Design a protein around this motif. Structure first.
Motif, PDB file in Angstrom:
ATOM      1  N   UNK A 102      -3.852   8.925  -3.432  1.00 44.01           N
ATOM      2  CA  UNK A 102      -5.182   8.723  -3.997  1.00 44.01           C
ATOM      3  C   UNK A 102      -5.569   7.245  -3.988  1.00 44.01           C
ATOM      4  N   UNK A 103      -4.568   6.372  -4.055  1.00 45.44           N
ATOM      5  CA  UNK A 103      -4.795   4.930  -4.038  1.00 45.44           C
ATOM      6  C   UNK A 103      -4.402   4.344  -2.688  1.00 45.44           C
TER       7      UNK A 103
ATOM      8  N   UNK B 188      -7.123   3.783  -0.245  1.00 43.50           N
ATOM      9  CA  UNK B 188      -8.300   3.066   0.239  1.00 43.50           C
ATOM     10  C   UNK B 188      -8.034   1.565   0.304  1.00 43.50           C
TER      11      UNK B 188
ATOM     12  N   UNK C  76     -12.117   5.032  -6.827  1.00 38.71           N
ATOM     13  CA  UNK C  76     -10.925   5.537  -7.502  1.00 38.71           C
ATOM     14  C   UNK C  76     -11.246   5.978  -8.933  1.00 38.71           C
TER      15      UNK C  76
ATOM     16  N   UNK D  50       0.846  -1.188   0.000  1.00 40.99           N
ATOM     17  CA  UNK D  50       0.000   0.000   0.000  1.00 40.99           C
ATOM     18  C   UNK D  50       0.884   1.242   0.000  1.00 40.99           C
ATOM     19  N   UNK D  51       2.144   1.056   0.384  1.00 41.61           N
ATOM     20  CA  UNK D  51       3.100   2.146   0.434  1.00 41.61           C
ATOM     21  C   UNK D  51       3.674   2.513  -0.917  1.00 41.61           C
ATOM     22  N   UNK D  52       4.644   3.419  -0.903  1.00 37.57           N
ATOM     23  CA  UNK D  52       5.254   3.915  -2.127  1.00 37.57           C
ATOM     24  C   UNK D  52       6.548   3.157  -2.420  1.00 37.57           C
TER      25      UNK D  52
ATOM     26  N   UNK E 102      -0.183   7.683  -5.116  1.00 37.50           N
ATOM     27  CA  UNK E 102      -0.235   6.614  -4.125  1.00 37.50           C
ATOM     28  C   UNK E 102      -1.112   7.001  -2.941  1.00 37.50           C
TER      29      UNK E 102
ATOM     30  N   UNK F  70      -3.764   9.840 -13.953  1.00 41.53           N
ATOM     31  CA  UNK F  70      -4.265  10.658 -12.852  1.00 41.53           C
ATOM     32  C   UNK F  70      -3.766  12.085 -12.993  1.00 41.53           C
TER      33      UNK F  70
ATOM     34  N   UNK G 223     -14.228   0.131  -3.943  1.00 39.40           N
ATOM     35  CA  UNK G 223     -13.018   0.949  -3.948  1.00 39.40           C
ATOM     36  C   UNK G 223     -12.571   1.313  -5.360  1.00 39.40           C
TER      37      UNK G 223
ATOM     38  N   UNK H 229      -5.743  -0.752  -8.514  1.00 36.57           N
ATOM     39  CA  UNK H 229      -5.979   0.635  -8.867  1.00 36.57           C
ATOM     40  C   UNK H 229      -6.311   0.816 -10.336  1.00 36.57           C
TER      41      UNK H 229
END
Lengths: 41, 733, 257, 48
Positions: free
Chosen positions: D38-39, D41, B553, B25-27, D36, C50, B549, B512
């Motif tokens: 925005x993504x 959730x 998005x 979920x991180x970068x 990231x 985006x 979700x 995503x």
RNA sequence: UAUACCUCUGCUUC
RNA sequence: AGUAGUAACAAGAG
């Protein structure tokens, strides 16, 4: 082929008009020749 | 009461809850600025692992070459590149003996493939090093430039269509004393204008012939570009990756095709096995090793990983591998296959941008190109770079490149190296000791099973495997690899524990919005959920949550909230109108502020197809207008099921090129585009099927249009005027 | 149309560049010069989209009358701009332009659409007509096997399928006759009859044909049902710890029984 | 240590008065991290 | 030097 | 400053 030509009515004569009686398939590239043949058929 | 999320592992075992140890979920970490340091690191280390071999100056390039193969064996655990040819050949002989027929069959398949392989095949190589402009370009452009360049040196192999004549022209172009190539330069021309001063100056570009000497050409042909790898997960420090020229592509394709044809038939190779099938392989491979030694037989699994995988493996071995594998094949094919290793054996490495020097006092900065790299006191560089640059010297070239005989680049001969790994796995025993090893290989990642009577033997088997791999130039990571009693293990981020567990985290980033377009990203978005439900163990609740979700998005990204909602925006202002106008609102797509109608059961159905019957005639008419301007000229990694509608659009081209000297390529492009757009009108199938022919592109159109004219006349479509006009036109052509 | 092609050809041949391109480039090399462009491979489209969606005019239009039917602005909103796109050489526009077109654009012909995308609709009827059963919780042994993802019209190898598609859509350009034509003459006849009147671009028809001719076979964890019309619903059929009884609509094969 | 804190009033939070502070800080981000963001959730799915 | 409180650009590589 | 982390941005170009 060369000498033979068709007139606008639809009759053969010896050579003016832009439409020969015989279409030449031999000599040309395969992919073209087949396109001609299939188009004609 | 202090919460501790690790304490879950008291209740649920680590494999069972492995998803929680992946922070996806991180970068992911990206690079910044130059990668020259990382490239130089690789250049230094690659030689560091082979410096006790044979140093010699190449009389062709004039570069410093190092040769570890058949060199002195290591007396330590430092990554050894000193492979022993004989041992490789034996390891191969074993494989051939246990897999007879494969070696020649694969070669015959690869050969018969090669013979059919055309030149256009090279266009699907993504980023390619263009030797004419010395930049990374699209493969198609890099190819086209190379062909147009070759044409100036009287090399028309491409015109035949096949790959072989092209490759021939490639190895032939090395013999050319001076290689000529195009380079564009601008010209002012007064075009007429209604502009007070009745004219305008537009800089018309024109092509200029430019020459390179044999050696300088060969050096470029042997060169590989470099760049830092971005977004690489699960790692602290960054590292470099390379890009190859157009020359070697054709020669690598065959070798990898061969290695693929081999690997496909191997049972201990995990390549090109799909991730889903890799389990089908692994669990069975385990099941075999389990029920093999009942009486106190300790089956141990070793979670393998290799260090300096690319930097230790030498081309000179791969050459021998090709030479052995191609035993039964004719000579030309052997000579063909032998080339890519020979090139990689004498390759050159480019060192990226360079290094940026600055002054904080003056607030100034400047990049120092690799040529000018040494045009400065080394004290002005930082402490580490000062150490690197000193070590780089012996392998440094005048033009600012690094000679690099040994080692491979990141992702080149994956198949052929996997073969070399399997070859290690093929021995299984040494000196008839009371153990037997087997396993699965995948490039730098491997899994090794070892069966024996007592673990003391197993460890010696593993040690034997290690000491064996050393002789192949394969180096096991003592730091990252670990061994345990069979039952659970890890392989390429797939976790086995009496059965492969799910690792939902791994795929989570894919959930995503993809970024193709409104039409596609929906299909993709649902399909990903649908698939992850099947493969990666996502329950119906979590799936239904992901369904939500993704729409969340999707609606923010594409700014298309519900028509009944009151979210403001340029698009929304029209969406609301569409909502008020349309009767069948449930027929509206989400992109048009319509309601989400998806659920678990209809993930596999396109939204348009779902909602079609609920749409209004005008709405579906507009939405699916055949000649709508939004969809471009289409032409037939994962694929998706979607309908071509107005939401199936394409974005604008990146415009940064407009104010650089590459403007030309826009005209050069569109010049082709016009010809291809016309040729497609003459031959409608061109978009679907690849046209074939060594004849002129114009000739085909002329003939086809002539026949079209004649038949359209004689059938009774065109009039005598149109026919005579057509023939009059064509007559001139 | 021929006259227009010849006229455009003559107009094109005037440009020495185009002439030399047409004379020098080969029919093979067409496959190369088509893919020639300034474009670069997007390495982070998830991001770039985006980003691009926050710009004023991210989309590129095709040059034509249908583009010109879109106005520059609409009730204050800028739909499109005068500035052309490098690739299309047509006007650029904002996403709004799509929403306008869908709302007040020209109503086009959609006759044949159902027959063209029949393959997809058959799923919709295979779901709509289906009947669900019990859900049962308890262990499930899943065996990972290669299976057919979607039900086809008639399974062929790619080479055989492409020729049929070629016979259907571009009969004049099919080239050398194969035996396949004689074997699937009825299928060809049918698809020819079904896809006659439609206005949709052939390149789409070939795609949808290839979808329902060429097979998509992939490894999946399966338990019990393995027929395509079951596989396509696999995500709902079962888990590791639960089972769902599902009865798909439409006819079922005898061999499958 | 990265923050600058002011004291800008008070509020009846849980019935009683609480002092409202203003935390002021200079920060920075980029396209990647915003995307990231925005993504984020998805943080649900991994735990659910 | 000036045009330039202008113009072009936001992944377009030297 | 700060973001950030083995090298960059905190605008670039004509």
């Amino acid at each position: 082929s060369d000498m033979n030509f068709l007139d606008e009515e639809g009759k053969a004569y010896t050579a003016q008009n832009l439409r020969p009686q015989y279409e030449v398939i031999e000599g040309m590239p395969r992919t073209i020749a087949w396109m001609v043949q299939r188009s004609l058929a | 009461m202090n919460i501790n999320p690790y304490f879950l592992f008291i209740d649920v075992p680590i494999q069972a809850a492995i998803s929680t140890t992946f922070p996806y979920t991180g970068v992911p970490p990206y690079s910044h600025g130059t990668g020259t340091g990382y490239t130089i690191d690789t250049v230094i280390r690659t030689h560091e692992y082979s410096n006790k071999g044979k140093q010699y100056i190449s009389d062709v390039t004039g570069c410093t070459m190092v040769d570890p193969t058949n060199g002195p064996l290591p007396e330590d655990n430092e990554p050894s590149a000193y492979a022993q040819l004989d041992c490789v050949l034996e390891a191969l002989d074993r494989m051939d003996e246990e897999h007879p027929g494969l070696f020649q069959a694969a070669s015959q398949n690869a050969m018969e493939t090669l013979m059919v392989t055309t030149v256009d095949k090279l266009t699907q190589g993504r980023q390619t090093f263009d030797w004419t402009v010395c930049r990374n370009q699209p493969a198609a452009t890099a190819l086209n430039t190379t062909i147009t360049s070759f044409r100036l040196n009287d090399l028309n192999g491409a015109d035949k269509g096949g790959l072989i004549p092209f490759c021939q022209d490639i190895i032939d172009s090395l013999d050319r004393p001076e290689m000529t190539f195009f380079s564009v330069k601008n010209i002012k021309k007064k075009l007429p204008a209604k502009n007070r001063k009745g004219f305008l100056i537009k800089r018309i570009p024109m092509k200029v012939k430019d020459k390179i000497t044999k050696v300088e050409y060969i050096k470029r042909a042997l060169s590989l570009n470099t760049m830092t790898k971005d977004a690489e997960r699960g790692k602290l420090k960054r590292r470099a990756i390379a890009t190859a020229g157009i020359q070697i592509r054709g020669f690598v394709l065959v070798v990898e095709n061969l290695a693929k044809n081999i690997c496909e038939n191997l049972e201990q190779s995990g390549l090109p096995v799909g991730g889903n099938e890799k389990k089908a392989k692994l669990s069975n491979a385990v099941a075999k090793m389990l029920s093999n030694c009942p009486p106190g037989g300790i089956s141990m699994t070793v979670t393998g990983d290799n260090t300096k995988w690319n930097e230790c493996l030498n081309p000179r071995i791969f050459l021998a591998m090709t030479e052995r594998i191609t035993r039964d094949s004719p000579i030309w094919f052997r000579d063909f296959c032998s080339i890519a290793p020979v090139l990689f054996s004498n390759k050159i490495a480019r060192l990226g941008k360079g290094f940026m020097i600055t002054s904080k006092t003056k607030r100034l900065k400047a990049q120092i190109p690799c040529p000018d790299l040494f045009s400065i006191p080394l004290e002005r560089y930082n402490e580490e770079t000062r150490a690197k640059l000193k070590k780089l010297k012996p392998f440094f070239n005048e033009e600012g490149t690094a000679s690099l005989s040994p080692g491979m680049m990141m992702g080149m001969f994956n198949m052929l190296s996997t073969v070399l790994g399997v070859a290690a796995l093929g021995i299984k025993n040494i000196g008839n000791k009371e153990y037997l090893w087997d396993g699965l290989q995948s490039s730098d990642d491997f899994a090794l099973f070892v069966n024996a009577k007592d673990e003391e033997t197993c460890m010696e088997g593993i040690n034997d495997f290690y000491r064996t791999c050393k002789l192949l130039g394969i180096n096991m990571s003592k730091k990252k690899s670990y061994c345990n009693e069979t039952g659970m293990f890890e392989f390429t981020s797939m976790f086995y524990r009496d059965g492969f567990v799910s690792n939902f985290a791994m795929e989570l980033p894919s959930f995503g919005v993809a970024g193709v377009n409104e039409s596609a990203d929906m299909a993709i978005g649902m399909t990903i959920i649908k698939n992850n439900m099947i493969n990666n163990g996502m329950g119906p609740a979590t799936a239904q949550t992901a369904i939500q979700l993704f729409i969340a998005d999707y609606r923010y990204t594409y700014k298309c909230h519900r028509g009944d909602s009151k979210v403001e925006g340029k698009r929304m202002k029209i969406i609301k109108e569409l909502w008020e106008n349309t009767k069948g609102r449930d027929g509206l797509l989400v992109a048009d502020g319509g309601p989400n109608i998806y659920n678990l059961r209809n993930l596999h159905i396109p939204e348009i197809v779902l909602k079609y019957n609920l749409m209004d005639p005008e709405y579906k008419g507009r939405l699916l207008h055949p000649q709508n301007p939004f969809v471009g000229h289409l032409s037939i990694k994962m694929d998706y099921d979607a309908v071509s509608g107005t939401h199936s659009w394409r974005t604008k081209r990146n415009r940064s090129i407009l104010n650089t000297d590459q403007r030309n390529m826009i005209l050069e492009e569109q010049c082709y585009a016009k010809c291809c757009n016309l040729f497609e009108a003459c031959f409608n199938s061109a978009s679907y099927r690849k046209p074939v022919g060594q004849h002129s592109m114009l000739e085909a159109m002329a003939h086809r249009l002539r026949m079209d004219a004649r038949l359209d006349y004689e059938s009774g479509r065109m009039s005598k005027d149109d026919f005579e006009k057509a023939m009059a036109h064509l007559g001139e052509i | 149309m021929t006259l227009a092609k010849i006229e455009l050809l003559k107009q094109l041949l005037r440009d020495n560049e185009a002439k030399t391109v047409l004379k020098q480039t080969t029919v093979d090399q067409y496959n190369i010069i088509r893919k020639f462009n300034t474009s670069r491979i997007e390495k982070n489209p998830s991001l770039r989209m985006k980003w691009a969606m926050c710009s004023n005019f991210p989309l590129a239009l095709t040059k034509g009358d249908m583009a010109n039917r879109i106005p520059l602005e609409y009730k204050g909103i800028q739909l499109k701009t005068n500035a052309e796109d490098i690739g299309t050489k047509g006007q650029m526009c904002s996403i709004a332009a799509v929403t306008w077109w869908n709302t007040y654009g020209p109503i086009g012909d959609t006759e044949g659409f159902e027959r063209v995308y029949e393959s997809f609709f058959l799923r919709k009827m295979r779901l709509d007509n289906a009947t669900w059963g019990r859900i049962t919780f308890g262990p499930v042994e899943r065996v990972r096997k290669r299976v057919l993802l979607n039900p086809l019209t008639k399974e062929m190898p790619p080479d055989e399928a492409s020729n049929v598609i070629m016979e259907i859509l571009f009969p004049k350009e099919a080239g050398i006759p194969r035996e396949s034509t004689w074997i699937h003459r009825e299928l060809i006849k049918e698809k020819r009859e079904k896809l006659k009147g439609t206005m949709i671009t052939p390149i789409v028809l070939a795609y949808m044909l290839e979808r329902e001719l060429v097979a998509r076979r992939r490894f999946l964890p399966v338990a019990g049902a393995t027929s395509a019309e079951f596989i396509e619903m696999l995500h709902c059929l079962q888990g590791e710890n639960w089972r769902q009884i599902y009865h798909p609509g439409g006819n079922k094969l005898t061999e499958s029984r | 240590p990265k923050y600058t804190v002011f004291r800008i009033g008070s509020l009846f939070v849980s019935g009683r008065e609480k002092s409202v502070y203003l935390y002021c800080r200079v920060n920075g981000t980029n396209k990647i991290q915003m995307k990231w963001g925005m993504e984020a959730r998805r943080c649900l799915l991994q735990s659910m």
